[PDB]
Amino acid sequence: WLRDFLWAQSSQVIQSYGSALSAYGLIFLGAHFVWAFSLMFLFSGRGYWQELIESIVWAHNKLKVAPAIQPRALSITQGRAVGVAHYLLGGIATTWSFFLARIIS
Amino acid sequence: ALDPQIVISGSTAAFLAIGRFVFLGYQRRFDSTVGPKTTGAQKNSTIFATNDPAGFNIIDVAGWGALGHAVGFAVLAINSLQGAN
Amino acid sequence: GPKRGSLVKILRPESYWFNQVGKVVSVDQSGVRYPVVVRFENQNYAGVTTNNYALDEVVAA
Amino acid sequence: AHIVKIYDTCIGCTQCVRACPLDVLEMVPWDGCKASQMASAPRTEDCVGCKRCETACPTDFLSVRVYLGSESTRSMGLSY
Amino acid sequence: GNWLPGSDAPAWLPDDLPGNYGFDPLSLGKEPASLKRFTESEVIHGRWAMLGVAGSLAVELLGYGNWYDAPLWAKATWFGIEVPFDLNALLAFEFVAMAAAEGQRGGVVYPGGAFDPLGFAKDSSKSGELKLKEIKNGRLAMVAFLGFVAQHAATGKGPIAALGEHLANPWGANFATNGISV
Amino acid sequence: DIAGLTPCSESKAYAKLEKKELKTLEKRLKQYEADSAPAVALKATMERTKARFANYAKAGLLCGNDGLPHLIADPYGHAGEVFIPTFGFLYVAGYIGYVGRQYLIAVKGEAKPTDKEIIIDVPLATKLAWQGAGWPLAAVQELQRGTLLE
Amino acid sequence: KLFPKFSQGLAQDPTTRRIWYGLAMAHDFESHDGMTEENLYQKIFASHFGQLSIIFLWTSGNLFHVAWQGNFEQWVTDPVHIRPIAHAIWDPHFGQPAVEAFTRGGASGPVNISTSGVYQWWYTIGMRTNQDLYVGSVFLALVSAIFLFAGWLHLQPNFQPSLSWFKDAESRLNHHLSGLFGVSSLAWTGHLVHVAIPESRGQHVGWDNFLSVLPHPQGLTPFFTGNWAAYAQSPDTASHVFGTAQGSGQAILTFLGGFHPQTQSLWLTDMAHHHLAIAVIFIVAGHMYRTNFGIGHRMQAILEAHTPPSGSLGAGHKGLFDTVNNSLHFQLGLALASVGTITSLVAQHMYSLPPYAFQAIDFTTQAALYTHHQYIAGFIMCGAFAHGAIFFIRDYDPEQNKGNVLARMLDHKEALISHLSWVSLFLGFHTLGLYVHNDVMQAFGTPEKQILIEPVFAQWIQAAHGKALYGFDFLLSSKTSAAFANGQSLWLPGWLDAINNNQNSLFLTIGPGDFLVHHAIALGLHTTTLILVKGALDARGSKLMPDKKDFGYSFPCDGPGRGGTCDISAYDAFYLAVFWMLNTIGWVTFYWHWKHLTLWQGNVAQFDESSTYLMGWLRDYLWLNSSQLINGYNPFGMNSLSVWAWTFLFGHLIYATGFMFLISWRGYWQELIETLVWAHEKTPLANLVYWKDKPVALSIVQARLVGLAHFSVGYIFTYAAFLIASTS
Ligand SMILES: CC1=C(/C=C/C(C)=C/C=C/C(C)=C\C=C/C=C(C)/C=C/C=C(C)/C=C/C2=C(C)CCCC2(C)C)C(C)(C)CCC1
Ligand SMILES: CC1=C(/C=C/C(C)=C/C=C/C(C)=C\C=C\C=C(C)\C=C\C=C(C)\C=C\C2=C(C)CCCC2(C)C)C(C)(C)CCC1
Ligand SMILES: CC1=C(/C=C/C(C)=C\C=C\C(C)=C/C=C\C=C(C)/C=C/C=C(C)/C=C/C2=C(C)CCCC2(C)C)C(C)(C)CCC1
Ligand SMILES: CC1=C(/C=C/C(C)=C\C=C\C(C)=C\C=C\C=C(C)\C=C/C=C(C)/C=C/C2=C(C)CCCC2(C)C)C(C)(C)CCC1
Ligand code: SF4
Ligand code: SF4
Ligand code: SF4
């Protein structure tokens, strides 16, 4: 699978640049980005984020640019939802750019 | 080349006579302010015990000549090289 | 204690409103320790707009 | 077992007793507060450390604290 | 007379100091401990660089010497005459000489005794009037010596030769033909 | 020239990058008539693509051994590459930021400010929008005055 | 009463957790039962010995198998065209053609190729036969036994040192600076002069005859005379062949610069003079703190004196003597920080200035090493920043440090954290923005529209160093500069010759592809430091949790209430920080690998042109150089790259388990177990077996570690397989 399917077939997507199919290369990379991006949410917890936000809020208040709507880290549940959502979207979109550029070319 | 017997004896004497008669009112007075301790409270007072006017122990000798020889060997050593600017 | 509705700075370091402003609702005239009941515009993490403080943990400014 | 303490900032609103799933806390008379009552933790050997008590406290900062400590069969929620 | 008309002189410079025209914007002498130090070092920089200038003018002033081209010989050469050696010998007998005499400053401005034989410092009412003149000939020299180093790095030239180049072509040869500003 | 790299106006590789791209589009354009729709696009792109190369050669950027224009980011041959644009940003970003500052503060004193972060007072914002044109002159004067910091 | 012997609390745990923690709690002395400062220091000391004994045994093991199973002697005779043997393999699992496959070199069975550079190390130092390796193996084994001995020795009440002794910092500093640094480098220099240099000149000097052999013709006459220049009279010729008489000189101490042209490594004469020179500075400097003689400095007095006027640094460093001498974690933080920097220091200087003969000709070895020390440096750094906050929690005395640099540090910590945040967001946005911009232009067939910034600043530095490519003419480039004229007749001819040979690694050529990646690395640095610093400074208290210091360094959370408090502890901060370690040094090692791979391959234009966009990394780095790797086996047949490809997939599989433990958490698994524990107890026959230790789900903190561990191992192993298999 690693070689005869993944490696060999990804050929047309990886060189899709300069063509009609280049959007699939862009989406190929973008979907990896967004997939990996999900891992930040999935692997972490809002305790860190809320303290981060404490420091940033300091910085805002120092310059009289603090919002009335008190900036809060996502809930644990929302962290999970954002995580799974970006994980799926990334994964699926990558397979999507893969097949279509592959089979069209 | 300069001779190796005059400069080592000269530079050693040039830093021992400097230490003997100048740097003592500078050295002995942050020697008494400095008091080595660690979170509350043996110094060999036999090696420091000296029948001297101002009190010159065996360490002061091996410390003030160390300048003199770090001078002496630095002088002689670079006289060997032909470093032209 | 402070006069009712007066703007008061908090000086209890472990508070969510530390060095922040609040308004006095009523200072209980009794032998209670934290008589100065303060209410704020902005909530804390625990969904609470109000707390009790001692006379040395307020300063009317 | 876990350690549970009540500090003097307690108002005695009783939410922390009423919230507990394992009956660790109780209300006692006191002389400090407007409600004339304070919270207490005499049964910490049955304490699980699930921190509902803390989540229930209105005081700033919380006037109940649960310090997760040495763990025993009860504190680990075991039925087996 | 303070350094910038209008401006108020800070709290820390008493004008009973010699040459206080109220210049410490960066407020480096705010602390009096750190001030007493700088009042001292000012005067010394003042004193050296006054000789420093006087010296490296006199070199090329009457003879075909130059202060930039003086160390060339690393046989030394005073006033056209030969010399008593080399490098190591000067270093040693300059180290000890300086190290001893500067070592024995257990810091003073006007130590007198030895250093005023002819006896000017004396008569309180004029003693200050010299100390102004001291520090102002002090500063004017410290500026000039920087002026001697600045012009050297731009050109080759050399103080009295640069002065002579400027007198020939003043409009032409000045400080906008080098690079401090392009 | 600077870092030894050639100027795009002269360099061979850059002028051979012209050729390759153009001669990719002229291998396509064969497969269509001259009157047709896509032929007007594959001519117009070429015209634009050939114009583009010409307009960096006239701009005078430094092109390397690669054939691609590299940029210069310090001092004055190549000011306009970064040094001018740079100010462009700090202005428009400073514009956005200071408008946003003047909005949040202008709301702050009005019982419930949180409503104005959502149901935004548009005719407040659109007045602050224009006011935020002269922002560095205000931003400086506010740093002076000493109302800028808590 | 049961193991954990050192913890009543854990020992009374009825479950499998007791076990896990027991393993996890083992080295944390301060947390054990009935512990004192004395037992702490003493156990730490003994543990240090224990470590040393494992190190010496390990090193001896390597030498042992190179001597016993390797082709050390075939290498010395022909270093260019022999693959250095690490070890033999006896695998009963191998198939017929596997045994044929792995028989490389002159081996009589299956063997593995060393990629440690221990060959070139040894060989350059003087090691010539298997005999030498055996004798060294015995020696160091003896040192291992000696160290073990020593550990148990100062355990007895007669030999137990007092806490006062441990707190004598001045003495340890003096001795380490003068002896451990000074004397041992002097003695090495002794080894280089007496053994390495003669060995390079083709005169084999051993234990039996060194004393009888003159390293210099008029030896020890210059030394006492002060005619030191005689030691640099005639260096090795430019046509000298390493390990042979041909072209060899007689000089023992030089400042030549550049490389030994055939080997392409630094001159052992330069190395000798280097070690000797530093040795002197160390020896003189190691007489600086006061002990039992009256002469020397006070640390306390130096630190307390350094408080600037007008309180711009508050109370300065007052009180830091005590809070450092008391705090062990502080010392480990400073140590790990410095050690991590110097580990990367080593890595970055060794590649560009290789010191070993016929290294750098060994691609695989070089790549393996440079990846090695950068990852080691990363972990070490995270660890430094991990005993950072342990200080902040357990050790800090707020009263005793009042208004110092440290307390003032805590004071404005929101500024520090928020400005790190700025610096990381800036880089993250712009660098990614310029790459993805670069990709889109590449995609639409207009690479001329790329934003390629030339690294003018580094190109300037390289120019100041004397590379002439860029034509700035500064310092060591310009022939009319004092800097040039001073040392032109010293070492600059060897230097300038080496910097401008672009087939070597010394100050490689730099273009816009270099520009982007360094800012990617900067993103790496600043963000990881953001996590670590934030974790350190908020270890004590925050607005969400003001009493955090009461709990300590690792805790799961503080409940779901008032928003939710997952990953709140400084522990978890360091955990989060490891992922950036991994990612950042991942970027740095890639950067490294490729920019060399394209140099060795003979087409640097591949790198300069594809490194400007990320597909370029994907296609031209990853997709291209795994071709041979993934082929190690196919349905048709097999070749020698079996192990790497096996291990490649091994690493990936480890990497994805990690995701399992990181993403899915306890409540699911416990209830899973909850049904399983019913299932067992009403299964007949199996009924007759019951567990002693109640089966329970791994903790949160356990899950946290176990994920991280799998992730890191998978990371390292996967890369290692890739790096080696591709470079080889
Ligand atoms: C009594 C008297 C006298 C005399 C005296 C004397 C005679 C003295 C001497 C002294 C001396 C005579 C001393 C010496 C010396 C010292 C020292 C202290 C030394 C040191 C050294 C060193 C430190 C070294 C170093 C080194 C090394 C080792 C290695 C390499 C090189 C070098 C150099 C780095 C008189 C008459 C005058 C007067 C009266 C009294
Ligand atoms: C020129 C140039 C350069 C350089 C630069 C630099 C070097 C810089 C630095 C800088 C710095 C060193 C800075 C600092 C700063 C500081 C601070 C302190 C700040 C502040 C800020 C603020 C305060 C703001 C405010 C505001 C406004 C105004 C508006 C909007 C809103 C807000 C509120 C945000 C380069 C080469 C790159 C490129 C070319 C050009
Ligand atoms: C091994 C050997 C060798 C060689 C050697 C070398 C190369 C070196 C050595 C070295 C050494 C062995 C030593 C060095 C040095 C030492 C010292 C020891 C120094 C010191 C100094 C000091 C102690 C001073 C002090 C002071 C004082 C007291 C006062 C004031 C301040 C001061 C800081 C000046 C030879 C070949 C001959 C022979 C064989 C063996
Ligand atoms: C790293 C290495 C190793 C190891 C090493 C070691 C660990 C060593 C040690 C150690 C050693 C191998 C040492 C030696 C030493 C020697 C000596 C030390 C000698 C001496 C002699 C003499 C005769 C001298 C004398 C004297 C004099 C004359 C004067 C002054 C005093 C004295 C006593 C010094 C091996 C190869 C395995 C592997 C590879 C690498
Ligand atoms: S909740 Fe906090 S306040 Fe209400 S009772 Fe329990 S402790 Fe007293
Ligand atoms: S923790 Fe859960 S159980 Fe232990 S007391 Fe507070 S509430 Fe009752
Ligand atoms: S960690 Fe698991 S338990 Fe502790 S809070 Fe976050 S979620 Fe609730």
Side-chain angles (χ1 to χ4, degrees), chain G residues 274-298:
Chain G
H274 169 202
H275 292 169
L276 252 180
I278 290 187
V280 171
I281 290 158
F282 278 145
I283 292 165
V284 171
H287 318 316
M288 86 164 282
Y289 322 95
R290 176 135 89 177
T291 52
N292 323 1
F293 288 88
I295 243 168
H297 280 309
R298 198 189 185 194

Short mmCIF file of all heavy atoms in Angstrom, two decimals, chain G residues 274-298:
data_model
loop_
_atom_site.label_atom_id
_atom_site.label_comp_id
_atom_site.label_asym_id
_atom_site.label_seq_id
_atom_site.Cartn_x
_atom_site.Cartn_y
_atom_site.Cartn_z
N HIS G 274 44.77 24.26 20.13
CA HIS G 274 43.43 24.63 20.62
C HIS G 274 43.20 24.11 22.04
O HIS G 274 42.91 24.88 22.98
CB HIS G 274 42.36 24.08 19.67
CG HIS G 274 40.95 24.16 20.16
ND1 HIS G 274 39.97 23.34 19.65
CD2 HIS G 274 40.35 24.92 21.10
CE1 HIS G 274 38.83 23.59 20.24
NE2 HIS G 274 39.03 24.56 21.14
N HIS G 275 43.34 22.80 22.18
CA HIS G 275 43.11 22.16 23.49
C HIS G 275 44.08 22.73 24.53
O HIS G 275 43.65 23.08 25.65
CB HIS G 275 43.07 20.63 23.33
CG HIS G 275 41.88 20.15 22.56
ND1 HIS G 275 41.78 18.84 22.12
CD2 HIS G 275 40.77 20.78 22.13
CE1 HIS G 275 40.65 18.69 21.47
NE2 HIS G 275 40.01 19.86 21.46
N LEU G 276 45.32 22.91 24.12
CA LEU G 276 46.35 23.47 25.01
C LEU G 276 46.00 24.88 25.44
O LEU G 276 46.05 25.18 26.62
CB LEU G 276 47.66 23.57 24.23
CG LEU G 276 48.78 22.59 24.58
CD1 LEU G 276 49.98 22.89 23.68
CD2 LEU G 276 49.18 22.69 26.04
N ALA G 277 45.64 25.72 24.47
CA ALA G 277 45.26 27.12 24.73
C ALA G 277 44.10 27.23 25.72
O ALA G 277 44.21 27.95 26.73
CB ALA G 277 44.92 27.80 23.43
N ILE G 278 43.01 26.53 25.44
CA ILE G 278 41.84 26.59 26.33
C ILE G 278 42.24 26.09 27.73
O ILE G 278 41.67 26.50 28.73
CB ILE G 278 40.69 25.80 25.68
CG1 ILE G 278 40.17 26.56 24.46
CG2 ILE G 278 39.59 25.48 26.69
CD1 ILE G 278 38.93 25.97 23.84
N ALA G 279 43.11 25.07 27.71
CA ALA G 279 43.58 24.41 28.94
C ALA G 279 44.18 25.43 29.86
O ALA G 279 43.91 25.42 31.07
CB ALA G 279 44.57 23.32 28.61
N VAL G 280 44.99 26.31 29.29
CA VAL G 280 45.63 27.40 30.07
C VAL G 280 44.61 28.37 30.66
O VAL G 280 44.70 28.73 31.84
CB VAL G 280 46.67 28.15 29.22
CG1 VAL G 280 47.19 29.40 29.92
CG2 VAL G 280 47.84 27.25 28.83
N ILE G 281 43.68 28.81 29.83
CA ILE G 281 42.64 29.77 30.29
C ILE G 281 41.83 29.16 31.42
O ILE G 281 41.53 29.85 32.41
CB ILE G 281 41.73 30.19 29.12
CG1 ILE G 281 42.47 31.08 28.12
CG2 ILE G 281 40.45 30.85 29.62
CD1 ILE G 281 41.86 31.09 26.74
N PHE G 282 41.50 27.87 31.29
CA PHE G 282 40.74 27.14 32.32
C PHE G 282 41.55 27.06 33.61
O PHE G 282 41.02 27.36 34.70
CB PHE G 282 40.35 25.74 31.83
CG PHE G 282 39.11 25.71 30.96
CD1 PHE G 282 39.02 24.81 29.90
CD2 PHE G 282 38.04 26.55 31.20
CE1 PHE G 282 37.89 24.76 29.11
CE2 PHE G 282 36.91 26.50 30.40
CZ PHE G 282 36.83 25.61 29.35
N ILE G 283 42.81 26.66 33.47
CA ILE G 283 43.70 26.45 34.64
C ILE G 283 43.89 27.75 35.42
O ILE G 283 43.76 27.72 36.68
CB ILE G 283 45.03 25.79 34.25
CG1 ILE G 283 44.81 24.34 33.80
CG2 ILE G 283 46.03 25.86 35.40
CD1 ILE G 283 45.98 23.72 33.06
N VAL G 284 44.11 28.84 34.71
CA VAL G 284 44.30 30.15 35.37
C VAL G 284 42.99 30.58 35.98
O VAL G 284 43.03 31.06 37.16
CB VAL G 284 44.85 31.22 34.40
CG1 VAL G 284 44.84 32.62 35.00
CG2 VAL G 284 46.25 30.86 33.91
N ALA G 285 41.88 30.40 35.26
CA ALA G 285 40.57 30.88 35.70
C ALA G 285 39.98 30.07 36.85
O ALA G 285 39.15 30.59 37.62
CB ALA G 285 39.62 30.91 34.52
N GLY G 286 40.39 28.83 36.96
CA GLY G 286 39.93 27.94 38.01
C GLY G 286 40.53 28.29 39.36
O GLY G 286 40.33 27.53 40.34
N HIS G 287 41.23 29.40 39.48
CA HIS G 287 41.71 29.78 40.82
C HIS G 287 41.03 31.05 41.33
O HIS G 287 41.75 31.88 41.91
CB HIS G 287 43.24 29.91 40.81
CG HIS G 287 43.93 28.83 40.05
ND1 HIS G 287 43.57 27.50 40.16
CD2 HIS G 287 44.94 28.88 39.16
CE1 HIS G 287 44.34 26.78 39.37
NE2 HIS G 287 45.19 27.60 38.75
N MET G 288 39.69 31.05 41.22
CA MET G 288 38.86 32.29 41.34
C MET G 288 37.91 32.36 42.52
O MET G 288 37.55 33.47 42.87
CB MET G 288 38.08 32.54 40.04
CG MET G 288 36.75 31.84 39.91
SD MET G 288 35.75 32.59 38.59
CE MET G 288 35.16 34.07 39.41
N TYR G 289 37.46 31.25 43.05
CA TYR G 289 36.60 31.28 44.24
C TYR G 289 37.36 30.92 45.51
O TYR G 289 38.29 30.11 45.49
CB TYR G 289 35.41 30.34 44.03
CG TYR G 289 34.87 30.33 42.62
CD1 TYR G 289 35.29 29.37 41.71
CD2 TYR G 289 33.97 31.28 42.19
CE1 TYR G 289 34.81 29.36 40.41
CE2 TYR G 289 33.48 31.28 40.90
CZ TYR G 289 33.90 30.31 40.00
OH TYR G 289 33.42 30.31 38.72
N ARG G 290 36.94 31.53 46.61
CA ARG G 290 37.62 31.37 47.91
C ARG G 290 37.29 30.02 48.54
O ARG G 290 36.13 29.59 48.54
CB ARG G 290 37.23 32.54 48.84
CG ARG G 290 37.78 32.44 50.25
CD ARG G 290 38.38 33.74 50.77
NE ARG G 290 37.45 34.64 51.45
CZ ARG G 290 37.80 35.80 52.02
NH1 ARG G 290 39.05 36.22 51.98
NH2 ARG G 290 36.89 36.55 52.62
N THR G 291 38.30 29.37 49.08
CA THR G 291 38.12 28.08 49.78
C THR G 291 38.80 28.12 51.13
O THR G 291 38.28 28.80 52.05
CB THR G 291 38.54 26.91 48.88
OG1 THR G 291 39.86 27.16 48.39
CG2 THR G 291 37.60 26.70 47.71
N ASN G 292 39.94 27.44 51.26
CA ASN G 292 40.61 27.25 52.55
C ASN G 292 41.90 28.03 52.66
O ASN G 292 42.72 27.70 53.51
CB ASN G 292 40.96 25.77 52.80
CG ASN G 292 39.92 24.79 52.30
OD1 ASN G 292 38.90 25.17 51.73
ND2 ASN G 292 40.17 23.51 52.51
N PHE G 293 42.10 29.05 51.83
CA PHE G 293 43.39 29.76 51.74
C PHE G 293 43.26 31.26 52.02
O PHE G 293 44.27 31.93 52.30
CB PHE G 293 44.01 29.55 50.36
CG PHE G 293 44.56 28.16 50.13
CD1 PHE G 293 43.75 27.15 49.63
CD2 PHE G 293 45.88 27.87 50.41
CE1 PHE G 293 44.26 25.87 49.42
CE2 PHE G 293 46.39 26.60 50.19
CZ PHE G 293 45.58 25.60 49.70
N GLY G 294 42.03 31.75 51.96
CA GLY G 294 41.75 33.19 52.17
C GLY G 294 41.73 34.01 50.89
O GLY G 294 41.09 35.10 50.83
N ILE G 295 42.43 33.53 49.87
CA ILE G 295 42.48 34.27 48.58
C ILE G 295 41.37 33.74 47.68
O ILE G 295 41.24 32.50 47.50
CB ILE G 295 43.91 34.18 47.99
CG1 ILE G 295 44.56 35.57 47.90
CG2 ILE G 295 43.96 33.43 46.66
CD1 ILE G 295 46.04 35.56 47.60
N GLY G 296 40.55 34.64 47.14
CA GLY G 296 39.51 34.24 46.20
C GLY G 296 38.24 35.04 46.36
O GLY G 296 38.11 35.80 47.33
N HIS G 297 37.31 34.86 45.43
CA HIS G 297 36.04 35.62 45.45
C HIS G 297 34.97 34.95 46.31
O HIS G 297 34.99 33.73 46.52
CB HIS G 297 35.50 35.82 44.03
CG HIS G 297 36.16 36.94 43.30
ND1 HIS G 297 36.28 38.20 43.85
CD2 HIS G 297 36.72 37.00 42.08
CE1 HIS G 297 36.90 38.98 43.00
NE2 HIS G 297 37.18 38.27 41.90
N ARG G 298 34.03 35.78 46.73
CA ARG G 298 32.71 35.38 47.27
C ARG G 298 31.69 35.54 46.15
O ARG G 298 31.48 36.59 45.52
CB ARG G 298 32.32 36.16 48.52
CG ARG G 298 31.21 35.51 49.33
CD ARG G 298 30.68 36.39 50.45
NE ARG G 298 29.69 35.72 51.29
CZ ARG G 298 28.89 36.34 52.17
NH1 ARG G 298 28.95 37.65 52.33
NH2 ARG G 298 28.04 35.63 52.88
#
